[PDB]
Design a protein around this ligand. Sequence first.
Ligand SMILES: CCCCCCCCCCCCO[C@@H]1O[C@H](CO)[C@@H](O[C@H]2O[C@H](CO)[C@@H](O)[C@H](O)[C@H]2O)[C@H](O)[C@H]1O
Ligand SMILES: CCCCCCCCCCCCO[C@@H]1O[C@H](CO)[C@@H](O[C@H]2O[C@H](CO)[C@@H](O)[C@H](O)[C@H]2O)[C@H](O)[C@H]1O
Ligand SMILES: [Cl-]
Ligand SMILES: [Cl-]
Ligand SMILES: [Cl-]
Ligand SMILES: [Cl-]
Ligand SMILES: [Cl-]
Ligand SMILES: [Cl-]
Ligand SMILES: [Cl-]
Ligand SMILES: [Cl-]
Ligand SMILES: [Mg+2]
Ligand SMILES: [Mg+2]
Ligand SMILES: [Mg+2]
Ligand SMILES: [Mg+2]
Ligand SMILES: [Mg+2]
Ligand SMILES: [Mg+2]
Ligand SMILES: [Mg+2]
Ligand SMILES: [Mg+2]
Ligand SMILES: [Mg+2]
Ligand SMILES: [Mg+2]
Ligand SMILES: [Mg+2]
Lengths: 347, 343, 345, 347, 348
Amino acid sequence: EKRLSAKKGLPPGTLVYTGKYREDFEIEVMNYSIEEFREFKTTDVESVLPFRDSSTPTWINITGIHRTDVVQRVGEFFGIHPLVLEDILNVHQRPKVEFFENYVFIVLKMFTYDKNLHELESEQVSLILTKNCVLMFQEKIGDVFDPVRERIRYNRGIIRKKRADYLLYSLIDALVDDYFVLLEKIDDEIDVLEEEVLERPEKETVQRTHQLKRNLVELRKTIWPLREVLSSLYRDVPPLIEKETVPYFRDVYDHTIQIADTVETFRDIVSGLLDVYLSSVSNKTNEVMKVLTIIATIFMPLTFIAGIYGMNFEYMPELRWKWGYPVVLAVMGVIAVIMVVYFKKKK
Amino acid sequence: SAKKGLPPGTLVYTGKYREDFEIEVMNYSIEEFREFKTTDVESVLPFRDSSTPTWINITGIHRTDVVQRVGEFFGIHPLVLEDILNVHQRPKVEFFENYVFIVLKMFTYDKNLHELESEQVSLILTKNCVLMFQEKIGDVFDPVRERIRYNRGIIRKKRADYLLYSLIDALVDDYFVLLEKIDDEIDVLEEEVLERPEKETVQRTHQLKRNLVELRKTIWPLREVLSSLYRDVPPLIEKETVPYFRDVYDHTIQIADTVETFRDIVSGLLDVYLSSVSNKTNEVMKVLTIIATIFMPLTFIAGIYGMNFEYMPELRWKWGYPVVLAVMGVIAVIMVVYFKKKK
Amino acid sequence: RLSAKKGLPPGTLVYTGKYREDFEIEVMNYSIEEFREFKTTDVESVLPFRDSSTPTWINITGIHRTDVVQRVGEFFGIHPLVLEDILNVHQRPKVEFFENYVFIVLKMFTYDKNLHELESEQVSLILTKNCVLMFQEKIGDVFDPVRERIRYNRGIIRKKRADYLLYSLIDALVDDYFVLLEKIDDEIDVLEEEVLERPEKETVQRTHQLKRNLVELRKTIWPLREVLSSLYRDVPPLIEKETVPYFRDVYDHTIQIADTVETFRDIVSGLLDVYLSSVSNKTNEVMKVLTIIATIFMPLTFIAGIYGMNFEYMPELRWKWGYPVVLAVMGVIAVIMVVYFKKKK
Amino acid sequence: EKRLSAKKGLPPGTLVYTGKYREDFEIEVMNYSIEEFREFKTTDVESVLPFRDSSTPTWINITGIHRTDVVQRVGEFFGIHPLVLEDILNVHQRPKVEFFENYVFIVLKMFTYDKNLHELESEQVSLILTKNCVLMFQEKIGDVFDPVRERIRYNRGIIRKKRADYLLYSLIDALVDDYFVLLEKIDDEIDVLEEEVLERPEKETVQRTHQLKRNLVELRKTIWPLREVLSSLYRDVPPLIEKETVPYFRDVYDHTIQIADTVETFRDIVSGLLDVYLSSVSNKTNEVMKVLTIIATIFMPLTFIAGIYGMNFEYMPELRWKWGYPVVLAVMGVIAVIMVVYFKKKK
Amino acid sequence: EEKRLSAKKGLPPGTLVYTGKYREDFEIEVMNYSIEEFREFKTTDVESVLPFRDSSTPTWINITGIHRTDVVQRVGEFFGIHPLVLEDILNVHQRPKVEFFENYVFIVLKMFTYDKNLHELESEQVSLILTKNCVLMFQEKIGDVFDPVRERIRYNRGIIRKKRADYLLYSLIDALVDDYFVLLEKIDDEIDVLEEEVLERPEKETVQRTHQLKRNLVELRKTIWPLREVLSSLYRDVPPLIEKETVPYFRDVYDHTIQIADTVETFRDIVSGLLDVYLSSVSNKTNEVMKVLTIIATIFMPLTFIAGIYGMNFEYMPELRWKWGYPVVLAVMGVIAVIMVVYFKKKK
Ligand SMILES: CCCCCCCCCCCCO[C@@H]1O[C@H](CO)[C@@H](O[C@H]2O[C@H](CO)[C@@H](O)[C@H](O)[C@H]2O)[C@H](O)[C@H]1O
Ligand SMILES: CCCCCCCCCCCCO[C@@H]1O[C@H](CO)[C@@H](O[C@H]2O[C@H](CO)[C@@H](O)[C@H](O)[C@H]2O)[C@H](O)[C@H]1O
Ligand SMILES: [Cl-]
Ligand SMILES: [Cl-]
Ligand SMILES: [Cl-]
Ligand SMILES: [Cl-]
Ligand SMILES: [Cl-]
Ligand SMILES: [Cl-]
Ligand SMILES: [Cl-]
Ligand SMILES: [Cl-]
Ligand SMILES: [Mg+2]
Ligand SMILES: [Mg+2]
Ligand SMILES: [Mg+2]
Ligand SMILES: [Mg+2]
Ligand SMILES: [Mg+2]
Ligand SMILES: [Mg+2]
Ligand SMILES: [Mg+2]
Ligand SMILES: [Mg+2]
Ligand SMILES: [Mg+2]
Ligand SMILES: [Mg+2]
Ligand SMILES: [Mg+2]
């Protein structure tokens, strides 16, 4: 209803941004050949539009898809189907490839993990590969893509030698790689949490356990498709040159499996955290209940006799007598002493 | 859940909705549009033979004679019409030579008392018509009606199969709304489960589980109905409508992701609460334990010196018990010190 | 009684089930123009119907008479493995295919409410030429409505052939399951009500019985779904454009049941964890009462037991305005132990 | 006595018996056809070597494969691969069916169950179908094949009319039949066990349920390859006479499924047995609390007032107007009785 | 508990970077052999092994200490190994695999070492490349399971000397897969000891060990599953692996691996209940602690109140004055104590 999960009743072609980031808008362009390169930014689309006809590889990054107007304008110019456009704009959706005639279309998820308050956020990056362009579409400023920029700029690696497909591999290889980062953060979280779980009895322990479990589920929900998307890229290939670029997506495929597995491992672990915790607590109850028993179980028989020697009659034998009070205190010290002897097994 | 012993062709509305019956009909082509309502079935019949798209919506299928009649007129096999009127059944598609047959489920989720309801929606695509069969009045189809009416979208331009698409599409899109609500209820529940120790909570928890089960049982085959429509297409215009069906599938893959997601999420809730309440039990134990461990030994010396004995001064010595009182105070001091490793 | 008949050759004919009670053969030969039906204990009398040109339903009941299964089978030309398959009632439902005939094993269920339990009886069907052969363990069945349909000519059955009678028999036999499931659905409803609102061990027990019975149900129903999958997708002596879509309809109910049998499994599966939580909570709130009485009364008996001391020259007895204030302070700490207790109780 | 799971360092054909039984060695032969049959035992492997070339089905039962010379001889004569000989000797393994050029190889297990102290042992059985011979290999004297022996002697059934592949069939069907016996015993154990769990709270119970869980896991591991074992015997069939022996293989294969389902039915039943125990313990903990609390909650407050009225004070007596003792005992009984009243709901 | 080696990022596709924890050893071994004779040697000079690319006879070249990525790059370029394959030899956090190429088979496998006492398992990654007449082996660290295979080559044991490079690769992976037998045995011992502990030893360190075992099992499954797939691909495809000879051998290894994997899922099946068996014991001791607490509580508290109503200072109240009251109250108190014990004769 409000800013989550619903644009409803709108026709099949409606361009609407569903995410939260309306802040920034910036349009980056990097063109390159083996010979030379150029880069620029701008806030005007009419400058970048002519690159669709380029003979040389081009990476056009639109940050600020919160502007539906520029997404549309570009979609139209490169001839992107309106359903596809709409997918780019609706950022709540699963990861996918859709191959078309003159183009490939890809929807990926970048993540961010804040430790301290433990939570994750996800930005949607959409890539379109057509002709010589990779069109990028982001929500906000910030991204994992920088090493690629450096690779182009400082001529490191093979990127300069290759055409646009290997560039889509470059952007996808970065995006996938940052998941390892997120995963390191998360195993750190796991270790911390199992320490806390066996050794540190509070309820905030439970709260954090649960938080990690959800963060893990959302992680997987985005992850398994992400694996299939790479899986598809590997087995089909309409404009992705074979004998050059194929083993490159394939290495991103092995990554997305190594990752898909790692979150599984994570899951099987975190599931039994809470069991370990129940085992910590009901074991802590056991030791308390043992203390209260020996405390109660010594003083309960004693307070009884001390109460039968405080009873008022007349006619009573042992009150006058006497020799009693030392013999009574004797029997008391004796019975509590055989209690403590009886407890040489327990605690 | 039982109509038994009846012949294969027997029309029995098996639903719980007995109240309303209505017939809505919209005939459109590119240049013009015409809509009407009625309770008279024959009046909507001549539309079987037209060369333009028409949406014929029969609400209140508890009236069987209408279903029989319309069926016989459009030439639909009695096994289908029975299927239409038996509303406990899974979403499927049957592909036929002169038509397609589709059963789907709309859901409804009441907050306050938290519960869900289902309507069964049937669709026949034949020649130039979409035949829609609803159990009761009101639907998620209002934006579609508004679209045909107001020439929004491409819908006016298009044909009967694309009308189908818009109908099913609207249906599927509503689940999004339902998911948002379930999400909210889940938020509330987990808040309460870690912070609010009550049995009404375990109930609400189990009910949410049960609901997620019913929802899953519907959602999963729904994924499959679109799976065919996208992949099969005998009288469905290819180059035009196949990509659009492909969308509704995408979404219905999504809805099924979110639902497993919820099941995974809720499935650990009862272990939270168990872990939470097993802790609060432990931390009230401590309180009862300290209260028992100081005040039990103390009440013990109070009982010695209340004993009535002919021997034993105190009696005399007349100091008190500053010293009884002081030994109490000192052993209490050390008990509490001992409990500086605890509460 | 029992689960092993062993050391025996593959052909050997043995009834493994528990009911030796009844024996009866019922025959209905019916055509478009007319119909006739009779019963008997005499086997040579039904044999000639092999060559009848019209639909016959031979329901042989009391398979515990092995010699009749032998007779009829050898006569109609049914293999020895199929005959033994008819006499062994411990087995999974299956469909096997052959030249002149189709072999079918199904299960009818009876669930007693009150004392909650289920028993099964096995029906074997053989469709051969114009005859459909039926085999039961004991008197009574789910098939009366198709009998009624044949006697009174209701619906399309009189027009059509023998494999349509297969269709109808099976359909009836599948439809039973719906009512079964309704019953089991009731059991589940009461059982969960009890589980959250009613902490006893008998409810542990019934939860277990329900889980078990549900297991049995899944185990019968799942191959049963695979049965009508095969009758729908294969079809050699089954008239296609006429019967095959009637076949698909049972195929569809067979599926609906299976999903429902799952829903019940998934729901039963949690019913223990809801019980554990109610008991724990119940265990908690039982503990809280113990403490609050202790923590207000235990320190109370202590300061109330100081002034029961027989020491002379307390002096503190000297306050003898005294006791009401001595009573007061008690209540005060008592109250402040209660005033410890009006948050979190 | 049962060499552990490893013989390593050894090259691939190394023929080593890894089991515990060295005790007996015997060889039994039955040559038969429609007309007649001859049967004999022996310790001499030379006299059973000629039967490889038999026109008519022979059954060679070698018992005592600890004698590895024998297995080597026989193996080399009938043309069996060193890897399969090795497989006949190493008894820690899964069942399999390997189809070769001139012969069929099966390994299968023959279980034995001890009730009382509950545990299961398994002898290996190896079967090689070659030409007209069934080669059969056993660790120890005693087996399940005695009634197939009897059908060969007393000419019961159709076995004499039929061939070597039918011999194979009979043997496998006796194996498979025995797992029913086994399952019956496990069902008995299961019933006693669940009954003891729900009505009988002791620890040797958990010990037993666990024993069973494990035993069923073992039985699963032996049976599931087996289901696939007779699956591949049913669906393939190069030298297995089709129109004769095939519907008989499918018969064993139906059995094999009932056995597995009977296993899976058991598993899902046992995995609930511990949760039954869990819920019985936690109701006992509750029911003990209940008893502690009604005693604590009626008497501790009644002790508080008896209590103030025993105090010896300067203004003592506070009351001493004789009314007025029994009024206190009255209000004692009244607050106790209304404690019971308040407990007339649950406890 | 800090930044772990996982991410090699910002780095190009071909980047050769060792991600392991072993920097210690470096050694290059060679055995070359034929039916007539063989030569074995070590060296740190890579250029001396290189000519073996062109040998007619099978040559196993073991390169221990892949941390030196110049050696790894050398042998790679010289053998025409594609940079991505090279990089995989170098990156050790990754699942076992086969990849087949025009001129070589790349394989990734894993050796596991378990230590008892403090219970923990380390792995080492092994790479193998079937290329022409060579198998290139790459190890992180000295020591390995391939000793008997060397021993066979040296002293002419088995058939290995007659067969070729493909059978040499069979021999290597067979010794590898065969290690997992030992490993599963050790994990079994720990399992028995640990379930005994779970029932009969109520300590928190027991819990620590149960969870530790569980984690070890998961890391062990994660590797062990595709290990199965690696041998399956190897059985069923076979481009330069001589078929009618070497395929059955590869099949055998596949078999043990199916066994290996089955076992691993059985251990998992057991350790998953191991913690519920603990929590059963614990609740049960406390259960039988609370009993003790409650039966001591319920006999004396009705007794301490009977002792309360007695003194208790009031007038009238015989009771006190008729004598006989004290002993008769020892009788009542006593008898009610004995009927509490009698009611508790359904308990202990
Ligand atoms: C030297 C003085 C001579 C006085 C007259 C002698 C008469 C002979 C009597 C036999 C002696 C036994 O006397 C015995 O004393 C003991 C305690 O002293 C009493 O026992 C008394 O105190 C014990 C405490 O241990 C209580 O458990 C018991 O309920 C109470 O009756 C016995 O009830 C009485 O039978
Ligand atoms: C002082 C003389 C030195 C020589 C030693 C002998 C001293 C006397 C020994 C006393 C033996 C104690 O054994 C016994 O104890 C109980 C207290 O539980 C006393 O008192 C008991 O009397 C009878 C038992 O029959 C009961 O009615 C009463 O309830 C009970 O208290 C008995 O009178 C005494 O016989
Ligand atoms: Cl690059
Ligand atoms: Cl009919
Ligand atoms: Cl119906
Ligand atoms: Cl049988
Ligand atoms: Cl071996
Ligand atoms: Cl036989
Ligand atoms: Cl890498
Ligand atoms: Cl060798
Ligand atoms: Mg849409
Ligand atoms: Mg790689
Ligand atoms: Mg019906
Ligand atoms: Mg879309
Ligand atoms: Mg006093
Ligand atoms: Mg049999
Ligand atoms: Mg059979
Ligand atoms: Mg139908
Ligand atoms: Mg070996
Ligand atoms: Mg082997
Ligand atoms: Mg890389």
